[PDB]
């Protein structure tokens, strides 16, 4: 079988990993790690588990961190 996603809802994984698409390939949709301190985050992306559906190639800020504009875009701090 071809692997193109482990889950869809972060609820299936655990706090720290999201079921989004990997930044390198939109084929990866497994429990991929969230952004850490100083990491780029999408303002449109809600806290994990994400309250909906979004085909974003970037996991939001890890539990405990806040996503805010830290330069050109939003970053976790």
Tab-separated table of N, CA and C in Angstrom:
chain	number	residue	atom	x	y	z
A	1	UNK	N	0.854	-1.211	0.000
A	1	UNK	CA	0.000	0.000	0.000
A	1	UNK	C	0.876	1.242	0.000
A	2	UNK	N	0.384	2.318	-0.596
A	2	UNK	CA	1.134	3.563	-0.655
A	2	UNK	C	0.835	4.419	0.573
A	3	UNK	N	1.878	4.954	1.188
A	3	UNK	CA	1.717	5.782	2.371
A	3	UNK	C	1.667	7.253	1.977
A	4	UNK	N	0.527	7.882	2.209
A	4	UNK	CA	0.345	9.284	1.866
A	4	UNK	C	-0.450	9.994	2.966
A	5	UNK	N	-0.354	9.465	4.176
A	5	UNK	CA	-1.052	10.051	5.293
A	5	UNK	C	-1.295	9.048	6.393
A	6	UNK	N	-0.910	9.404	7.604
A	6	UNK	CA	-1.101	8.533	8.753
A	6	UNK	C	-2.440	8.817	9.407
A	7	UNK	N	-2.836	10.078	9.365
A	7	UNK	CA	-4.079	10.507	9.974
A	7	UNK	C	-4.650	11.729	9.258
A	8	UNK	N	-5.603	12.382	9.911
A	8	UNK	CA	-6.235	13.586	9.380
A	8	UNK	C	-6.484	14.565	10.515
A	9	UNK	N	-6.909	14.026	11.644
A	9	UNK	CA	-7.166	14.823	12.826
A	9	UNK	C	-6.055	14.603	13.834
A	10	UNK	N	-5.478	15.697	14.316
A	10	UNK	CA	-4.379	15.649	15.284
A	10	UNK	C	-4.764	14.834	16.510
A	11	UNK	N	-6.068	14.754	16.754
A	11	UNK	CA	-6.624	13.996	17.870
A	11	UNK	C	-6.155	12.538	17.827
A	12	UNK	N	-5.937	12.038	16.615
A	12	UNK	CA	-5.483	10.667	16.404
A	12	UNK	C	-4.041	10.481	16.880
A	13	UNK	N	-3.257	11.549	16.815
A	13	UNK	CA	-1.865	11.506	17.243
A	13	UNK	C	-1.738	11.944	18.703
A	14	UNK	N	-0.994	13.016	18.930
A	14	UNK	CA	-0.799	13.524	20.269
A	14	UNK	C	-0.236	14.928	20.248
A	15	UNK	N	-0.434	15.660	21.339
A	15	UNK	CA	0.048	17.030	21.451
A	15	UNK	C	1.541	17.097	21.143
A	16	UNK	N	1.882	17.822	20.090
A	16	UNK	CA	3.265	17.932	19.685
A	16	UNK	C	3.429	17.577	18.225
A	17	UNK	N	2.488	16.788	17.718
A	17	UNK	CA	2.501	16.361	16.326
A	17	UNK	C	1.150	16.651	15.671
A	18	UNK	N	1.166	17.065	14.408
A	18	UNK	CA	-0.065	17.379	13.695
A	18	UNK	C	-0.172	16.537	12.426
A	19	UNK	N	-1.399	16.313	11.971
A	19	UNK	CA	-1.650	15.505	10.779
A	19	UNK	C	-1.697	16.358	9.510
A	20	UNK	N	-0.830	17.356	9.431
A	20	UNK	CA	-0.781	18.220	8.263
A	20	UNK	C	0.163	17.648	7.215
A	21	UNK	N	0.405	18.414	6.165
A	21	UNK	CA	1.307	17.991	5.110
A	21	UNK	C	2.719	18.456	5.430
A	22	UNK	N	3.711	17.627	5.156
A	22	UNK	CA	5.087	18.006	5.444
A	22	UNK	C	5.528	19.151	4.534
A	23	UNK	N	6.346	20.042	5.079
A	23	UNK	CA	6.843	21.203	4.347
A	23	UNK	C	7.624	20.809	3.095
A	24	UNK	N	8.219	19.626	3.105
A	24	UNK	CA	9.004	19.176	1.965
A	24	UNK	C	8.142	18.462	0.922
A	25	UNK	N	7.093	17.768	1.351
A	25	UNK	CA	6.234	17.066	0.403
A	25	UNK	C	4.790	16.970	0.891
A	26	UNK	N	3.865	17.399	0.041
A	26	UNK	CA	2.439	17.370	0.340
A	26	UNK	C	1.896	15.937	0.371
A	27	UNK	N	2.792	14.965	0.238
A	27	UNK	CA	2.430	13.563	0.256
A	27	UNK	C	2.446	13.041	1.691
A	28	UNK	N	3.224	13.698	2.543
A	28	UNK	CA	3.315	13.297	3.936
A	28	UNK	C	2.227	13.967	4.755
A	29	UNK	N	1.425	13.145	5.414
A	29	UNK	CA	0.350	13.619	6.273
A	29	UNK	C	0.277	12.744	7.513
A	30	UNK	N	1.432	12.484	8.100
A	30	UNK	CA	1.505	11.661	9.297
A	30	UNK	C	1.592	12.566	10.508
A	31	UNK	N	1.811	11.975	11.672
A	31	UNK	CA	1.962	12.751	12.899
A	31	UNK	C	3.309	13.479	12.867
A	32	UNK	N	3.375	14.584	12.135
A	32	UNK	CA	4.615	15.340	12.017
A	32	UNK	C	4.720	16.379	13.137
A	33	UNK	N	5.936	16.596	13.663
A	33	UNK	CA	6.184	17.528	14.779
A	33	UNK	C	5.770	18.977	14.510
A	34	UNK	N	5.399	19.662	15.589
A	34	UNK	CA	4.976	21.058	15.539
A	34	UNK	C	6.170	22.001	15.647
A	35	UNK	N	5.927	23.272	15.350
A	35	UNK	CA	6.973	24.277	15.409
A	35	UNK	C	7.396	24.605	16.829
A	36	UNK	N	8.693	24.808	17.020
A	36	UNK	CA	9.237	25.137	18.331
A	36	UNK	C	9.551	26.628	18.431
A	37	UNK	N	10.272	27.009	19.478
A	37	UNK	CA	10.625	28.402	19.700
A	37	UNK	C	11.488	28.937	18.563
A	38	UNK	N	11.048	30.038	17.967
A	38	UNK	CA	11.778	30.637	16.870
A	38	UNK	C	11.414	30.030	15.529
A	39	UNK	N	10.478	29.086	15.536
A	39	UNK	CA	10.043	28.442	14.303
A	39	UNK	C	8.903	29.208	13.671
A	40	UNK	N	8.827	29.128	12.359
A	40	UNK	CA	7.784	29.816	11.607
A	40	UNK	C	6.447	29.111	11.791
A	41	UNK	N	5.392	29.891	11.939
A	41	UNK	CA	4.062	29.343	12.130
A	41	UNK	C	3.044	30.126	11.318
A	42	UNK	N	2.006	29.445	10.868
A	42	UNK	CA	0.969	30.089	10.089
A	42	UNK	C	-0.104	30.630	11.019
A	43	UNK	N	-0.374	31.943	10.955
A	43	UNK	CA	-1.384	32.590	11.804
A	43	UNK	C	-2.771	31.979	11.608
A	44	UNK	N	-3.021	31.515	10.386
A	44	UNK	CA	-4.294	30.904	10.027
A	44	UNK	C	-4.466	29.533	10.682
A	45	UNK	N	-3.354	28.915	11.055
A	45	UNK	CA	-3.382	27.607	11.691
A	45	UNK	C	-3.725	27.748	13.174
A	46	UNK	N	-4.751	27.031	13.613
A	46	UNK	CA	-5.176	27.088	15.008
A	46	UNK	C	-4.384	26.096	15.846
A	47	UNK	N	-4.512	26.209	17.166
A	47	UNK	CA	-3.810	25.324	18.093
A	47	UNK	C	-4.168	23.862	17.825
A	48	UNK	N	-3.221	22.975	18.090
A	48	UNK	CA	-3.417	21.544	17.895
A	48	UNK	C	-4.027	20.922	19.153
A	49	UNK	N	-5.028	20.029	19.002
A	49	UNK	CA	-5.559	19.605	17.695
A	49	UNK	C	-6.328	20.713	16.981
A	50	UNK	N	-6.086	20.839	15.682
A	50	UNK	CA	-6.737	21.851	14.866
A	50	UNK	C	-8.245	21.619	14.812
A	51	UNK	N	-8.985	22.668	15.122
A	51	UNK	CA	-10.444	22.641	15.139
A	51	UNK	C	-11.044	22.729	13.734
A	52	UNK	N	-10.684	21.789	12.870
A	52	UNK	CA	-11.223	21.788	11.525
A	52	UNK	C	-10.371	21.008	10.546
A	53	UNK	N	-10.286	21.512	9.325
A	53	UNK	CA	-9.497	20.885	8.278
A	53	UNK	C	-8.707	21.948	7.528
A	54	UNK	N	-7.445	21.663	7.247
A	54	UNK	CA	-6.591	22.612	6.550
A	54	UNK	C	-5.434	21.876	5.887
A	55	UNK	N	-5.259	22.095	4.592
A	55	UNK	CA	-4.188	21.443	3.846
A	55	UNK	C	-2.912	22.278	3.889
A	56	UNK	N	-2.492	22.633	5.093
A	56	UNK	CA	-1.287	23.421	5.274
A	56	UNK	C	-0.070	22.511	5.394
A	57	UNK	N	1.021	22.903	4.756
A	57	UNK	CA	2.244	22.116	4.786
A	57	UNK	C	3.139	22.517	5.961
A	58	UNK	N	2.526	22.928	7.062
A	58	UNK	CA	3.277	23.323	8.242
A	58	UNK	C	2.441	23.150	9.505
A	59	UNK	N	2.992	22.449	10.488
A	59	UNK	CA	2.309	22.255	11.760
A	59	UNK	C	2.376	23.545	12.569
A	60	UNK	N	1.327	23.862	13.341
A	60	UNK	CA	1.292	25.074	14.165
A	60	UNK	C	2.309	25.010	15.308
A	61	UNK	N	2.205	25.933	16.249
A	61	UNK	CA	3.116	25.958	17.385
A	61	UNK	C	2.822	24.821	18.343
A	62	UNK	N	3.878	24.225	18.875
A	62	UNK	CA	3.742	23.127	19.816
A	62	UNK	C	3.050	23.608	21.084
A	63	UNK	N	2.376	22.690	21.758
A	63	UNK	CA	1.641	22.996	22.980
A	63	UNK	C	2.501	23.784	23.968
A	64	UNK	N	2.002	24.948	24.372
A	64	UNK	CA	2.728	25.792	25.297
A	64	UNK	C	3.249	27.053	24.637
A	65	UNK	N	3.589	26.949	23.358
A	65	UNK	CA	4.113	28.084	22.609
A	65	UNK	C	3.011	28.887	21.942
A	66	UNK	N	3.268	30.173	21.762
A	66	UNK	CA	2.309	31.056	21.137
A	66	UNK	C	2.796	31.528	19.765
A	67	UNK	N	1.908	31.487	18.780
A	67	UNK	CA	2.238	31.926	17.430
A	67	UNK	C	1.964	33.421	17.299
A	68	UNK	N	2.993	34.195	16.984
A	68	UNK	CA	2.840	35.636	16.841
A	68	UNK	C	3.842	36.170	15.837
A	69	UNK	N	3.530	37.309	15.239
A	69	UNK	CA	4.418	37.903	14.250
A	69	UNK	C	5.755	38.239	14.888
A	70	UNK	N	6.790	37.553	14.438
A	70	UNK	CA	8.129	37.745	14.964
A	70	UNK	C	9.092	38.102	13.839
A	71	UNK	N	8.705	39.082	13.041
A	71	UNK	CA	9.530	39.500	11.931
A	71	UNK	C	8.704	39.785	10.700
A	72	UNK	N	8.872	38.950	9.689
A	72	UNK	CA	8.161	39.084	8.448
A	72	UNK	C	6.813	38.367	8.539
A	73	UNK	N	6.816	37.231	9.221
A	73	UNK	CA	5.623	36.427	9.405
A	73	UNK	C	5.470	36.052	10.873
A	74	UNK	N	4.615	35.082	11.138
A	74	UNK	CA	4.375	34.625	12.494
A	74	UNK	C	5.336	33.503	12.860
A	75	UNK	N	5.834	33.542	14.085
A	75	UNK	CA	6.751	32.534	14.583
A	75	UNK	C	6.373	32.172	16.011
A	76	UNK	N	6.741	30.972	16.411
A	76	UNK	CA	6.426	30.469	17.738
A	76	UNK	C	7.368	31.033	18.793
A	77	UNK	N	6.797	31.468	19.904
A	77	UNK	CA	7.558	32.021	21.008
A	77	UNK	C	6.776	31.820	22.300
